Design a protein around this nucleic acid. Structure first.
Lengths: 201, 337, 185, 125
RNA sequence: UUGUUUUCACUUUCUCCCCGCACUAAUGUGGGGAAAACUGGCUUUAUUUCUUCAAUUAUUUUUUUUGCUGAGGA
RNA sequence: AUUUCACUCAUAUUAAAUAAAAUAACUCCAAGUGGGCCAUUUUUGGUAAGCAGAACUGGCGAUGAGGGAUGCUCCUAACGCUUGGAUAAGGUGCCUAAAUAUUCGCUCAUGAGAUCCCAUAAAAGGUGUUGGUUCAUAUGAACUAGCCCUGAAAAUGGAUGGCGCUAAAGCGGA
RNA sequence: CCUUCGAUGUCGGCUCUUCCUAUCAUUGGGACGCAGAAGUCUCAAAGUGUCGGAUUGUUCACCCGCUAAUAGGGAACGUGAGCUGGGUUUAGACCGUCGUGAGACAGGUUAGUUUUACCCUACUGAUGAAUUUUAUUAUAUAUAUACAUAUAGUA
RNA sequence: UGCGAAGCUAAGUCUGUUGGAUAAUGGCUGAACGCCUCUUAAGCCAGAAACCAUGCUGAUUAAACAAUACUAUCUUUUUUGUUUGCUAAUGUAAAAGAGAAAUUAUAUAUGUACCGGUACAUAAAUAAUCCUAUCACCUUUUUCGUGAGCUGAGCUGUGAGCUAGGCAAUAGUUCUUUAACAACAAAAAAGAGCACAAACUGUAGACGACUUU
């Protein structure tokens, strides 16, 4: 809302709640980038959501399907369309808000090296009872005709290994900095030391 | 209300729009699926339609009314001068599709290949491919190593040699032939070996093999709906002519549907036709290329008087059973099944 | 909605049980089995020293409470299967055309021929960890054995359903392959 | 929107235009009350050409006076300033459109020596 | 044709005893018996700044930070 | 019966209450109108009808504004031009201003459901689940009514308004 | 009798497309009063196909025949600036019945002008610029960068 | 009137796939309900001319994009400015610290060490956190890290710091705190070929367009 851009890791979020939050942010003017859109969850069984998408697919202008509703199978495009449906995209301001959103499957080159945020108000773990059925957007997209799921999976595992190496290096650096801080806390003046200790620094 | 009598629709909606093809050359939409177990090999070739003849062959179909009898079959002659491999393109898979990593070139390319990059070659000073071919061998190996490391689809750029044909055209047709076979390393080695030499038809195809043919049909300009879609002629009494579709749609929807046949362009369409059998791969060297064991005469494939509207087949050729889309001289892409 | 409801399952002698986040691994002399129960709200306490496992539900409604005994039966099935292989004895019954069974691929991929004299091979694979052979006592019998009861019974069902008769009176044309008995080795 | 300059309140600017005068050349913008039957503007539909009404009337303490806080008086003679000799502070003068240059110069001279302001002081020079 | 009176049955245990004697969801547990009286309740005296003096209504008196407006000219 | 004289029957709150009751009463001249329609309730003919014919009141007409996505007649509310405040109807996940509010239950639908008018659904069923009632030594029955399910089929592609929503953004409350 | 009487071209056929499913055949199933064969009832299913002729203006109908099946419907009773014009439904004429008569007749018969697209859209094909507040699934020797990168012409 | 090449043409000739996930249904394990039960719970299987892919057609259907080949006076730093139709020349949908790269599970996770398991730690209002800001100047005493040139190594500069000193701010009470990014113009310093048309073609065609020389 007050950042240059917000990168949201869409894994484990419910599609509609995520889209509502994103749409409000975009209308308020905050640029967001949604990554790992293939791991979005939807409440209801996979078969039920596939039935819904087949209903969507049966929908076209029979005079000319080119003008018909473009259906779009990538999970990132599905999230984009849901956000657009939650947005006044036929006005100039609504179109600007829509264009302020960027959706990706996986984590591409700039967004895998920056902080990813999470919206707790749309997390499946917090919004669905454990005994109720849900589906995975990437799986639904593959059943509908996306057929890029496995490639995203292997790219994700490679990114996981790279991130693990980076995290190990970061942890070592943090431990070294911590030990340096403890060794230097004894060299500053006692008054400054008591100030830091009193205020928990 | 419903139709009084039902009959199937005129024409196939799967070949829409019936517009002119973007290009004369037949373009592979998809190559055969890669099988790692097989050794590396080429999957496609380009030749030129020379003409048609007929052959006599003995049938070996038990339980058929033909069987041991000798039958006559129409065949198409495609002149296939050896192609020249000049390039290597590496492809890697991304969620957005196949992405080119890089294309490397051979140390030398022919003026025939260079002509394809020019609209006016005669008046230009032919500076294309003149200073990018002096790239260091180290940089070439670097690019090839990166291709081996990161790419999963390998294609070799190869071009035809129209000077070996009676074509008036001088600029070569150049295409990518996907290498299907073993590992990325083996594919790269296989193409690197023949990075600059001729690729004959025999190394790509074997006799008695089924292949697909990709080409552009014979053009006919704009044709009426009767010829273009095969609709029925209206009766002789029709006031404003009979060569048309009577009703082009119901009142509602208040539009004309895209499924209604209309006048428009006919022919010059891109077509991929499957299962044409290679009857013979006739070599340029031998003088009895059109001879058989039952004929033992000394004659080549070219009929006396020449191939009409084409010329004389002086190079490697292959005899395809049946017909193939396109005029004479048309470039024809042969693809493995 | 009952506040707490538990059930206890005794661990047999020669098995080793590991339960982490309701992902159970049971090891025995006849192999190892793995089952995930992460689809149920369950608190599992494995007592390695004094044997037994207790599965407890908090605030369970009857629909969920019905799954406690299901989980317990699955666990004891795992135990019995890993201590003594589950065995499904199956009979090839036929009226006029004897069914010719051939076992290949080191007791997998059983191929049957001459079912109603069709002279077409009907082959069925065995699920992982399942071995199919022919009995040494009765000629028309088939053993489907293995540690995992699910896999073994599914293999028997696959064999039975690959040989169903079509377009005839089913209650008159009784030929087929039928699970005669369920036991252990 | 109202505009307020000192004690002056102009309750509305951008004078009312005749309905549909924007897209018909034969319909001039001069206001006419739409008599009509189903006329949108007459029925006061939202978002179309509001009609003038007495509610827009200006405060009568500052009604007819100009931005200089004076009432304008149009003269065509030097002899038509005698009333202004006693009202020089609340009347400004404006010269009539059809007064020649000579008479205009005389009127400006008389107004200045009467310290009465002139609206169109630099006309025709 | 209402009142009046009587009986038992009602509590905590980080207590004890027996049985299962580790069987529990449990740093405990199920069943069967005892115990006083911490806990809980009541009766007296002093206090309400250790702590509480609530809430609602009636009746009164203030208070923090602040938006908009200034007709008139006796 | 009338007439004339006497006496006197609250009025200082007014021969019961309340009343921007004299914004009255009366007279003259004259316009337009004299096809009506709708809603609640009652009602006649008709199988029924957005059908035909009546009664009361209110509306539409003649009338905009906020809401019901949309709508001549429904709800709030009727209108000079403004500045603040606070509300009605109705809403507070996004579209869309305001609750992903709080608190307690119910519901999983392989065609869930979701604001009067209003945009259809029945007889008959369910060993789905949630509460109740009455009978039989924690069991077997019979009922009962909430939500859900079957019953439930139409023609361009399609509509709780759309997206979507299941630890509701559904249903019944607070 | 709500909309059209300062006009929405009123039957049928031909042509052509699409849609529905309450499925005739074809696919896979369940039940049978199911031995086999044939059939009947029924489920998921609209992907594919549902014909040639005699008579009649006909729709409808009825036969001949093929077929695997010759299923039922919608789209302004789909479709007349698409046709045709046999019927109905102007003016000529004939018959029968009715009428004194002029004339009438869901009684029959015969002959009787079927206008316009060059506009918008739709559809079918055919040229074609311009596209930075635009785009990025990278680019750099086990290593940094969106605080970045990208001009343009030709092919 | 015969015959009638070439070209069109059908009545002539050739060609017209296989995977995934499912519906009906039949089943597996299995409680509810000691038994039973395809689930009318959880968890599974096989399965149709249907569905989605594969394949095919288009892709100015994405005002889409990549690699390649060649080329256009062109390309890199500083100062001042953008206060006959033109010939110097400016725009922001969003700077005020626009700070923050592990992964995952939600009836638990993550690291480490051994052989998915075992053991041990860590975390569990997680951003309710952490990191980054103000110490000007100049001089003095000095310490530690990086760039130019030089020969693993010395010097200069740069960043941070140590000791000591004195040295500045002032515009009348605030009117946005002119502070960012990107571009452009002028002046200075350094490095650097095609296409259309035309004639021809006819694999094309109403004209454009397209295939060619």
């Amino acid at each position: 809302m007050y950042k240059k851009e917000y990168v949201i890791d869409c894994k484990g979020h419910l599609l509609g709640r995520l889209a509502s939050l994103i749409a409000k942010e975009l209308l308020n003017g905050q640029r967001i980038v949604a990554v790992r859109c293939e791991d979005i969850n939807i409440s209801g069984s996979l078969y039920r959501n596939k039935l819904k998408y087949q209903e969507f697919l049966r929908l076209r202008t029979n005079t000319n399907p080119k003008k018909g509703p473009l259906h779009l199978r990538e999970p990132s495009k599905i999230l984009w369309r849901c956000v657009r449906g939650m947005l006044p995209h036929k006005t100039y301001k609504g179109q600007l808000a829509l264009k302020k959103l960027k959706v990706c499957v996986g984590m591409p080159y700039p967004y895998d090296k920056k902080k990813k945020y999470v919206l707790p108000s749309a997390l499946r773990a917090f919004r669905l009872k454990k005994h109720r059925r849900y589906c995975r957007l990437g799986t639904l997209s593959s059943r509908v005709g996306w057929n890029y799921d496995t490639l995203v999976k292997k790219n994700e595992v490679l990114r996981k290994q790279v991130s693990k190496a980076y995290y190990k290096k970061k942890v070592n650096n943090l431990n070294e900095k911590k030990e340096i801080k403890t060794e230097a806390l004894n060299l500053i003046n006692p008054e400054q030391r008591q100030v830091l200790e009193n205020f928990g620094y | 209300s419903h139709r009084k009598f039902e009959r199937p629709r005129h024409g196939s909606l799967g070949f829409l729009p019936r517009k002119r093809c973007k290009r004369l050359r037949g373009k592979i939409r998809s190559f055969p699926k890669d099988d790692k177990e097989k050794p590396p090999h080429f999957t496609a070739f380009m030749g030129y339609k020379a003409g048609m003849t007929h052959i006599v062959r003995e049938v070996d179909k038990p339980g058929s009314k033909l069987h041991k009898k000798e039958i006559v079959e129409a065949c198409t002659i495609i002149e296939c001068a050896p192609m020249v491999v000049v390039g290597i393109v590496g492809y890697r898979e991304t969620p957005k599709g196949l992405r080119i990593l890089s294309t490397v070139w051979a140390n030398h390319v022919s003026d025939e290949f260079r002509r394809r990059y020019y609209k006016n070659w005669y008046k230009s000073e032919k500076k294309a491919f003149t200073k990018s071919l002096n790239v260091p061998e180290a940089t070439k190996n670097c690019l090839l190593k990166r291709i081996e490391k990161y790419c999963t689809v390998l294609r070799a750029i190869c071009h035809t040699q129209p000077s070996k044909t009676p074509l008036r055209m001088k600029k070569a047709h150049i295409m990518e032939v996907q290498i299907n076979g073993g590992s990325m390393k083996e594919k790269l080695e296989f193409v690197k070996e023949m990075l600059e030499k001729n690729l004959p038809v025999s190394t790509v195809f074997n006799p008695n093999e089924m292949i697909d043919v990709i080409s552009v049909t014979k053009g006919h300009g704009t044709k009426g709906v009767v010829s273009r879609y095969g609709v029925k002629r209206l009766p002789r009494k029709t006031h404003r002519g009979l060569r048309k579709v009577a009703c082009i749609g119901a009142w509602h929807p208040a539009r004309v549907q895209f499924q209604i046949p209309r006048h428009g362009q006919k022919g010059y369409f891109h077509r991929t036709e499957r299962n044409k059998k290679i009857y013979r791969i006739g070599l340029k060297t031998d003088k009895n290329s059109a001879s058989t064991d039952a004929d033992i005469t000394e004659k080549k494939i070219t009929p006396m008087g020449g191939f009409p509207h084409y010329g004389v087949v002086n190079e490697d050729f292959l005899l395809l059973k049946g017909c193939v889309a396109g005029t004479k001289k048309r470039p024809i892409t042969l693809r493995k099944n | 909605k009952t506040i707490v409801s538990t059930q206890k399952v005794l661990i047999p002698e020669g098995v080793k049980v590991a339960i982490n986040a309701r992902k159970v691994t049971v090891s025995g002399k006849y192999g190892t089995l793995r089952r995930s129960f992460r689809h149920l709200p369950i608190d599992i306490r494995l007592n390695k020293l004094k044997k037994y496992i207790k599965v407890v539900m908090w605030f369970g409604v009857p629909d969920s409470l019905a799954c406690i005994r299901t989980v317990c039966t699955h666990l004891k099935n795992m135990f019995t299967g890993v201590t003594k292989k589950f065995l499904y004895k199956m009979r090839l019954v036929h009226a006029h055309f004897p069914i010719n069974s051939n076992i290949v691929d080191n007791n997998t991929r059983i191929e049957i021929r001459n079912y109603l004299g069709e002279k077409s091979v009907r082959f069925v694979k065995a699920l992982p960890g399942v071995v199919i052979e022919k009995s040494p006592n009765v000629k028309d019998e088939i053993y489907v054995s293995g540690a995992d009861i699910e896999n073994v019974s599914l293999t028997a069902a696959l064999i039975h359903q690959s040989v169903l008769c079509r377009n005839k009176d089913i209650r008159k044309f009784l030929d087929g392959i039928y699970v005669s008995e369920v036991t252990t080795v | 929107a109202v505009k307020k300059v000192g004690k002056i309140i102009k309750k509305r600017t951008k004078k009312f235009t005749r309905f549909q005068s924007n897209r018909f050349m034969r319909v001039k913008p001069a206001w006419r009350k739409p008599r009509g039957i189903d006329c949108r503007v007459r029925r006061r539909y939202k978002g179309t050409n509001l009609m003038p009404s007495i509610g827009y009337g200006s405060n009568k303490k500052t009604k007819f006076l100009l931005p200089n806080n004076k009432y304008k008086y149009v003269v065509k003679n030097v002899k038509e300033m005698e009333p202004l000799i006693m009202n020089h502070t609340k009347y400004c003068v404006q010269i009539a459109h059809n007064v020649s240059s000579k008479k205009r110069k005389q009127i400006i001279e008389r107004a200045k020596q009467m310290n009465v302001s002139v609206i169109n002081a630099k006309a025709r020079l």
